[PDB]
Amino acid sequence: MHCPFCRHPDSRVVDSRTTDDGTSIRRRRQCPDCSRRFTTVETCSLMVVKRSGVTEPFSRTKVINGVRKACQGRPVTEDALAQLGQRVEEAVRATGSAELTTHDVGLAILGPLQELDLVAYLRFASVYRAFDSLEDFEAAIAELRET
Amino acid sequence: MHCPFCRHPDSRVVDSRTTDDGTSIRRRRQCPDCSRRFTTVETCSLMVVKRSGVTEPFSRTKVINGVRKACQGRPVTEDALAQLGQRVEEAVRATGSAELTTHDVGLAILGPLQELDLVAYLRFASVYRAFDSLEDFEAAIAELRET
Amino acid sequence: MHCPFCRHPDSRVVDSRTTDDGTSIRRRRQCPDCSRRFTTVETCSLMVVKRSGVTEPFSRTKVINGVRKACQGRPVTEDALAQLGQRVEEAVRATGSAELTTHDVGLAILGPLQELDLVAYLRFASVYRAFDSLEDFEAAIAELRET
Amino acid sequence: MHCPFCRHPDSRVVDSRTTDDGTSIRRRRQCPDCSRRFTTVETCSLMVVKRSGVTEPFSRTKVINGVRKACQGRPVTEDALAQLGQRVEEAVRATGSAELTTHDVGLAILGPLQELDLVAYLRFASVYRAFDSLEDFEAAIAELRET
DNA sequence: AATCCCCACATCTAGTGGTTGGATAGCGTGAGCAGCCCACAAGTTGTGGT
DNA sequence: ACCACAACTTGTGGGCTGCTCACGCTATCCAACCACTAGATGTGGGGATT
Ligand SMILES: Nc1ncnc2c1ncn2[C@@H]1O[C@H](COP(=O)(O)OP(=O)(O)OP(=O)(O)O)[C@@H](O)[C@H]1O
Ligand SMILES: Nc1ncnc2c1ncn2[C@@H]1O[C@H](COP(=O)(O)OP(=O)(O)OP(=O)(O)O)[C@@H](O)[C@H]1O
Ligand SMILES: Nc1ncnc2c1ncn2[C@@H]1O[C@H](COP(=O)(O)OP(=O)(O)OP(=O)(O)O)[C@@H](O)[C@H]1O
Ligand SMILES: Nc1ncnc2c1ncn2[C@@H]1O[C@H](COP(=O)(O)OP(=O)(O)OP(=O)(O)O)[C@@H](O)[C@H]1O
Ligand SMILES: Nc1ncnc2c1ncn2[C@H]1C[C@H](O)[C@@H](COP(=O)(O)OP(=O)(O)OP(=O)(O)O)O1
Ligand SMILES: Nc1ncnc2c1ncn2[C@H]1C[C@H](O)[C@@H](COP(=O)(O)OP(=O)(O)OP(=O)(O)O)O1
Ligand SMILES: Nc1ncnc2c1ncn2[C@H]1C[C@H](O)[C@@H](COP(=O)(O)OP(=O)(O)OP(=O)(O)O)O1
Ligand SMILES: Nc1ncnc2c1ncn2[C@H]1C[C@H](O)[C@@H](COP(=O)(O)OP(=O)(O)OP(=O)(O)O)O1
Ligand SMILES: [Zn+2]
Ligand SMILES: [Zn+2]
Ligand SMILES: [Zn+2]
Ligand SMILES: [Zn+2]
């Protein structure tokens, strides 16, 4: 890990203190040339297993794209979509699991989206839940209306 | 057919083919005086006036793309989409108008859409009619129910 | 040219009256089956010859894209860009030439764009005229300021 | 390093490589208890806070793309762009901050930009500083002149 | 303006040949991960400091 | 609450073989454009309403 301050190769570890609550080792490293210290944290990569079966890293671009398609025409600014993507990623990482299932990403998305825009929420659910008849539409308006 | 280059009084057609659908015939006409050869397209008048008022030519690739998005995940193969594009283009040509507002190209889609797929119909309406809320999703479910 | 009303092949020409001022033959055609008449106009395809040397059909998408990149961040709605593209195409076709040179499309664009947005105009000219030093920037502000 | 799956107290590293630039080391750690193998990435903290406030990780592909657009048509090859990306990334890492607002990533580009190319500098400023009018194009030409 | 009757004929279709360019599969040659290996370089209790 | 320093040994990191995925190459197929010939057929005069 080249030193950030002087770009000299092979820095040397000083401390390697694993933290418990977070599963993140915190190693302080120091450079041989400049004699300075940089803190480095190591955290497990988030990944989502798809409906197909294979696994891929979590991207907020895909969350924001999916929400943006549903919000088409509605007064939702790009700032709100970015904030929603951030909230979804935070909620996903709060569980701490390394591998999550697209289905939970969807249940995490459907929380903030419902407060963001109702029509967007139903237009998102109609593709997420794979509606087939009209009956599902007023069924969903039922659950939304109950609140 | 005056030559566009030398403004010659008349010109001659080397090669003619009915190139698009049956809608247009494309000719290669050369000018005897200057021996330069130009291409030309003959077709019936069909110009969609957009929401802004900008007069833009009619294209099936833009009336299908707005339907492919609506029927997301539904068993509506590409053949059905091409068939619906054909049907809507024929329906809008048959009325014999040279200036068809784009507000009346949606109504030409809501007809065949109910037959094509019944949930995709509502999904197309949500963006086309800009449903402000869940209450309008219900009413559209109601009026459709009456048929 | 399949008849629009009944889609029967090989319609038959009735009149072929070339018009002078426009270089557009107007042929009225009639169908053998339905016995109805459709008017068809034939006009030379607009084409632009590029700086490379080859020729390509005129597209308003490319005009609007070029103007949109320059207008980035400025308060110019997409409606104004569509109207500007329409005006540019109208001005280009007013000359009546079949082949135009990208350079004139640029001089046609720089007319409406200057009234649309000054900063957009200079950011467009800086790429169109291929500026090399700062001196060009206040040189151009000179000509703009003279009006 | 607790296993994310079975919450085992400790785990072991099968394979380690310094994968990105010198910035990160990526390890493949397996759990002896459950024999499942997870990947992990270690790197220094660097998080750009965007204009909205959304904390997004630092990427050179987004600091070069905003410069490639500015130097449109100028003789600034891809090697120079990569070199400038390296220089700006190093300059922002060397300050040793874990939260660098994106308003201060532009200032880290305006430095090397003057050396790289002098018209591209002004073009980057027009969008970055949102010049409302031609008068501000002049002032920036003036302040640059003083250097 | 737009459209609508003739009639006769010059000419436009269209129906074959050639090219030529651009997709387009099937190849070959890269890229990655895994499974080894050991010792040196990293973790791991101790005492601390601010 | 990091941050520092101690020894030290267990551990990780690098270094080393294979493998599978992918992706960059090319000889072939269809499409488009040009050259060509005759005859339906599209034009180009001629009136004539709306
Ligand atoms: N890589 C990803 N990172 C984060 N969110 C993702 C990712 N891929 C998909 N998502 C989101 O999670 C949800 C997944 O729901 P969906 O029904 O589309 O499942 P899927 O596994 O993506 O389906 P498909 O079988 O088409 O891959 C969507 O809201 C989608 O935007
Ligand atoms: N140029 C076009 N050709 C054919 N259909 C079009 C064209 N433009 C729009 N449509 C169709 O017209 C319908 C009306 O929808 P829409 O409001 O999107 O029209 P629009 O002209 O694109 O206006 P807007 O600028 O508001 O999007 C849609 O189904 C759309 O596919
Ligand atoms: N096909 C096109 N139809 C209409 N406008 C076009 C077309 N191609 C380019 N233009 C526009 O005309 C102008 C051409 O100016 P420019 O200096 O870019 O020349 P160019 O011939 O496009 O250059 P290049 O050598 O990159 O092809 C631009 O405003 C561009 O948007
Ligand atoms: N995630 C990022 N990583 C690195 N540089 C970034 C990132 N986001 C923006 N920048 C850079 O920050 C500078 C500031 O410009 P800019 O206003 O576009 O920032 P921004 O975060 O994209 O905000 P905005 O939402 O207003 O576009 C630009 O030069 C841009 O390339
Ligand atoms: N046309 C649409 N209108 C509204 N919401 C939509 C639309 N299409 C998709 N969505 C929503 C519901 C889906 O669960 C979510 C993401 O679906 P999708 O478009 O398949 O992208 P994705 O992230 O799954 O891509 P990929 O399958 O390539 O990984 O977006
Ligand atoms: N994701 C979607 N889900 C449901 N319906 C949709 C979706 N996207 C488009 N539609 C419907 C409603 C819209 O009025 C119609 C076409 O919209 P739009 O994309 O604006 O038209 P367009 O592509 O023909 O024109 P333009 O590109 O000029 O906007 O299709
Ligand atoms: N970054 C930019 N900022 C402002 N105006 C720009 C920018 N890039 C290009 N332009 C303007 C000036 C150019 O004359 C015009 C079109 O240029 P360009 O981007 O080359 O597209 P184009 O239409 O020439 O594409 P093509 O070369 O593929 O045909 O747009
Ligand atoms: N066409 C252009 N001409 C001149 N300068 C430009 C152009 N496009 C971008 N820039 C400059 C000014 C902008 O502040 C900067 C980057 O802008 P931008 O594209 O918003 O950033 P980005 O791609 O890093 O982030 P984001 O995608 O989140 O908006 O580059
Ligand atoms: Zn160093
Ligand atoms: Zn001529
Ligand atoms: Zn007919
Ligand atoms: Zn485990």
Author numbering:
A (entry chain B), B (entry chain A), C (entry chain D), D (entry chain C): 1 to 147
Text from the published report:
NrdR, an RNR-specific repressor, controls the transcription of RNR genes and, often, its own, in most bacteria and some archaea. NrdR senses the concentration of nucleotides through its ATP-cone, an evolutionarily mobile domain that also regulates the enzymatic activity of many RNRs, while a Zn-ribbon domain mediates binding to NrdR boxes upstream of and overlapping the transcription start site of RNR genes. NrdRs (140–220 residues) consist of an N-terminal Zn-ribbon domain followed by an ATP-cone domain and in some cases a C-terminal part of variable length and unknown function. In contrast to all earlier suggested mechanisms, we show that the NrdR monomer contains two nucleotide-binding sites, one inner site that binds ATP and one more exposed site that can bind either ATP or dATP.
The structure of dATP/ATP-loaded NrdR in complex with the nrdRJ promoter (3.3 Å resolution) reveals an NrdR tetramer bound to the dsDNA. The relative orientations of the dimeric Zn-ribbon domains and the ATP-cone domains differ between this tetramer and the ATP-loaded tetramers that build up the dodecamer. The binding of NrdR to DNA is mediated by a pair of Zn-ribbon domains interacting with the phosphate backbones at each NrdR box via six arginines from each domain, including the highly conserved RRRR motifs. The short distance between the DNA-binding regions of the two Zn-ribbons, in each Zn-ribbon pair, is the main cause of the compression of the minor groove. The DNA kink leads to strongly distorted base-pairing compared to canonical B-form DNA and to several exposed bases that interact with NrdR. Two amino acids that appear to provide DNA sequence specificity are D15 and R17 on each Zn-ribbon, which form an intricate network with the exposed bases in the palindromic NrdR boxes, where the GC base pairs at positions 9 and 18 in box 1, and 40 and 49 in box 2 are highly conserved. As the dATP/ATP-loaded NrdR tetramer contains two DNA-binding sites 80 Å apart, it is suited to bind to two NrdR boxes located approximately three dsDNA helix turns from each other, also contributing to the specificity. The structure of DNA-bound NrdR suggests that this tetrameric repressor prevents transcription of RNR both by directly blocking access to the promoter region as well as restricting access for RNA polymerase in the sharp 180° turn of the DNA. Our results clearly support the assumptions from the cryo-EM structure of DNA-bound NrdR that conserved residues D15 and R17 are important for the specific binding of NrdR to the nrdRJ promoter sequence. The dATP/ATP-loaded NrdR will then bind to RNR promoters and restrict transcription of the RNR genes.
